[PDB]
Design a binder for this molecule. Structure first.
Ligand SMILES: *[C@H]1O[C@H](CO)[C@@H](O)[C@H](O)[C@H]1NC(C)=O
Ligand SMILES: *[C@H]1O[C@H](CO)[C@@H](O)[C@H](O)[C@H]1NC(C)=O
Ligand SMILES: *[C@H]1O[C@H](CO)[C@@H](O)[C@H](O)[C@H]1NC(C)=O
Ligand SMILES: [Cl-]
Ligand SMILES: [Cl-]
Ligand SMILES: [Cl-]
Lengths: 390, 390, 390
């Protein structure tokens, strides 16, 4: 089940250490073996975001109450309410017709002020992932027939003592992929999505800072509140309905994600350096596969410019290296664009996930060699920050 | 033409691989050679940004039409137009004098509402560069007397098969320089610039999200529209002229960039690790140059704290290493601040580009050794996000 | 005083170079030694941010003057002032009661406009740290019984010539910790803090772009200015007091930082690669400490998810490696979360600083082995962008 480490991925020093490169991906696991010692496996078990900070909260369903109105006859100056100075209140000033029929000695315009109490009933939250929120669990196993290392952006290193191998340092970083500088965690009711940051910040709903407070205070309440036409002494204030449906539609296409409580689970990717004492490893070689591949399922698209391809091998020579190619609209082999580190069929009866990054526009993905090759045409659309909330 | 790889930039393992460090820069090319094998050259051919997402669009020239006005006599309540609920329309409410001369039984203030249709005629776009938008083409050549690798942030690796050398992995990353988290691609008409992000976001023009929509809807239309003084029954609405000229002036100093269609070409920089099978490379040594250097052209300034210096060598001992130094206002040699990886005169008749990062304030750049040295004084101003749009 | 380099942290090539990993932290210093050569020490001396760009300036104390009012009798149209078109002026329109007692032939509402000149008296500035603003001074010493390298994000490399060791390349990067994409430098009067970016951008004070200008022009002046109730011909305009006190309270908990002029000093952290010519280094081993540790001071908390622990060793076997562990609320050893690279007691009478990154929630920190161990319970609160400015 593990992919063996190739001799290009390590150096034994004449003196000093043996240094080893590995890439860990959800699912995959990597293995190597030293001069007469037990097998060594490494594997990424999970990737979690925990307790991310709120950027802003937004209101998708508001309620209105305590509607108060003050009005004054044309010769009686500007109307005033004390709730004008209350930030729980949303207020509006006008002038209305006044005259004999409503208590005034003159026909003319009278001042009017109306204030109502705004309450958010249903809100959503946009949350930022910082370095302190990301965590990876990496399990390292010596096959005397396991130790779970915790890796974080600020604590990328874990020194671990192994039977027979000795002290082994794991020095791991996240692979380049999802960018938490640009993507925000959006949580509405019970579901979550990854959305672009300015998309979120520019949403036209009442909003409040994520900052620490005792007194929740909304900005842009007007976006959900409608003051109806005023009468001499009274004016109705109304509220829009819930915008959960408008938000659901605007989020169409955004990646949904699974979060229990304050924890969100990702499909992580790590690049690691292993440092151990000077030691001669047994590098593992693989011949290019020679048989055919079928698509175990449809080519899936990520929201950050990649595609995931899962294939099944039909040939006889596993374990072997999967021949992979990308060609742009016009046949040019690209000699790159393969994201998966270890494109290896280690088990003929296990499907193999391959991630790759197609050119923009029309292109072709090719797995396998020769005429036996699976050829798939792909169209990749230019980048977008999301769909407009209406 | 290529700079040879020095023995400090590789290790051959006692076992495992040979690992090699190289830095690739536009222009330069690097070379090395193994125990009785053909020469090996690597070179970065181009760097492209393709199809970046729109953050916002901004309106620099608007037009107005369908101006409609409703007015009511003092005793006839609030004026209303259905276009008040139309987001293509920009509206304004007031009260105006009404009386016998314009159909009203009373002298007093009458309600008035005016709505006009806003259209953007000329817009600009600010676009964000994400990882999926960046691409590098690297050509690798074996001198039997070439293979073009594609490298991207998410797919930094390219395995390539070479004559005599075997399987060679290119593992490349962008060098630290331009920061696409901070700098935005601004496109107005046919020209483009790199501008700071908050500079852009805080521009005082009507704007609309880059988000996907069928119905273009502007925010802050007031910034280009002027409602003139209202009359009893009518009111003119006017629009500012084009702000292309104000934008051109505010962009003064911002780096202009070349973009055909959705592609923008950069002068890229890559740091690479080459991994190949255990092999003894022939490391190349260079003596410090001993002759003199002339400036083939004026010292050029970037907008991110560097300067580019291109020099010509006048001495006899090429290929050789160019002695370089930086001293702060008060003579302190800085032992650093040289950005160029391979400051090598490989060809006496080719000029050499050198990039360096001066201290802030007054300093000196020094190329060459001794009294034969070229000494240049430099002033570097503190950082700025740009000039104010007025 | 220096921590010796372990044999896991270097490789001597069979051919090519000797490559060495080191982590440099304020305080610590690292050392190694080659086959019959003088000792070699490296140490980070300082970390400075110099001349960061202004994002926005915000006004915390404003002043008002040149209050002008125009008013018109009910039958005399809309009031107007030329300062309405002056961006130094803040203006407000209404209608007021007019009648025989103030010069008008009719009782009714008359137009009124009031304009006052806004001036900021006390401002604050939020500043962004870019790559060109960060600098590290690294001193390298050969013990014949020192050369100061300058390292920056864009110029991470420094080639230095040493007695006996030869040419030595320092290739250094900042460790993952403070994130200048997210944290902004806030300067009010003479103090500075690190604050979150959106916290700052969403502050409710009058603001102006950091962009280059001759004419300082504020947005959202209303936030400090109060137009009092208008009279027939006059209206007072007033200004809030200074908000320095409200800002001081809202900044409660934000990290304060020391800045003289345009320079801000940090407690930096660097990860370095040393490249020198092929050479057999003397790797240094340390046994795990066996004695006890006391807390020389209280466990300190950073604002980015770490804690600093300084301990004193009471045992007899220095220099030795400090046994460190973290367990989550329920006893699980985490095999990671240690940030300090070289957790070494090199001197029994010097305290040792240890930085670590606890799980969120309840956990335990453990220094020392066995029953002699110091066991400390910790609670870590979820992330926050700061406290609400009220
Ligand atoms: C008005 O709302 C309720 C009546 O429904 C009353 O008890 C409450 O104290 C008032 N709230 C405010 C702030 O007006
Ligand atoms: C008004 O504008 C044109 C007349 O120029 C008319 O044909 C069009 O349908 C109207 N548009 C709106 C929305 O008022
Ligand atoms: C008004 O303010 C002062 C009087 O205090 C006067 O000298 C100045 O020129 C005027 N400024 C403006 C712009 O009104
Ligand atoms: Cl009436
Ligand atoms: Cl009239
Ligand atoms: Cl009166």
């Amino acid at each position: 089940r593990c992919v063996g480490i190739g001799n290009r991925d390590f150096v034994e020093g004449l003196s000093g250490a043996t240094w080893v490169d590995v890439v860990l991906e959800h699912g995959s696991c990597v293995t190597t073996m030293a001069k007469d010692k037990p097998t060594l496996d490494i594997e990424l078990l999970k990737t979690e975001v925990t307790n991310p900070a709120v950027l802003r909260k937004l209101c998708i369903e508001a309620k209105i109450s305590n509607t108060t109105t003050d009005s004054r006859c044309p010769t009686q100056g500007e109307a005033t309410l004390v709730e004008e100075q209350d930030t729980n209140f949303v207020c509006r000033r006008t002038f209305v017709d006044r005259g004999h029929g409503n208590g005034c000695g003159l026909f003319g315009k009278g001042s009017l002020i109306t204030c109502a109490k705004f309450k958010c009933v249903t809100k959503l939250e946009g949350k930022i992932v910082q370095y302190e929120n990301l965590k990876y669990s990496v399990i390292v196993t010596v096959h005397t027939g396991g130790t779970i290392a915790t890796i974080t952006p600020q604590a990328p290193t874990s020194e671990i003592q192994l039977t027979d191998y000795g002290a082994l340092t794991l020095d791991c970083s996240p692979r380049t992929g999802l960018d938490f500088n640009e993507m925000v965690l959006l949580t509405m009711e019970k579901k979550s999505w990854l959305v672009h940051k300015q998309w979120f910040l520019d949403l036209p709903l009442p909003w409040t800072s994520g900052a620490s407070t005792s007194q929740e205070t909304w900005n842009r309440q007007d976006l959900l509140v409608t003051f109806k036409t005023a009468h001499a002494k009274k004016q109705e204030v109304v509220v829009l309905g819930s915008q959960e449906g408008a938000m659901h539609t605007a989020l169409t296409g955004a990646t949904e994600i699974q979060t229990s409580g304050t924890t969100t689970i990702f499909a992580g990717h790590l690049k690691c350096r292993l440092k151990m004492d000077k030691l001669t490893l047994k590098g593992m070689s693989y011949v290019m596969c020679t048989g055919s591949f079928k698509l175990e399922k449809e080519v899936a698209e990520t929201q950050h410019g990649t595609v995931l391809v899962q294939v099944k091998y039909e040939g006889t020579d596993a374990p072997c290296k999967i021949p992979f190619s990308s060609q742009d609209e016009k046949g040019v082999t690209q000699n790159g664009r393969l994201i998966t580190a270890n494109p290896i069929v280690t088990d003929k009866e296990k499907p193999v996930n391959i991630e790759a990054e197609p050119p923009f526009g029309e292109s072709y993905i090719v797995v396998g060699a020769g005429e036996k090759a699976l050829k798939l045409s792909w169209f990749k659309k230019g980048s977008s920050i999301g769909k407009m909330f209406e």
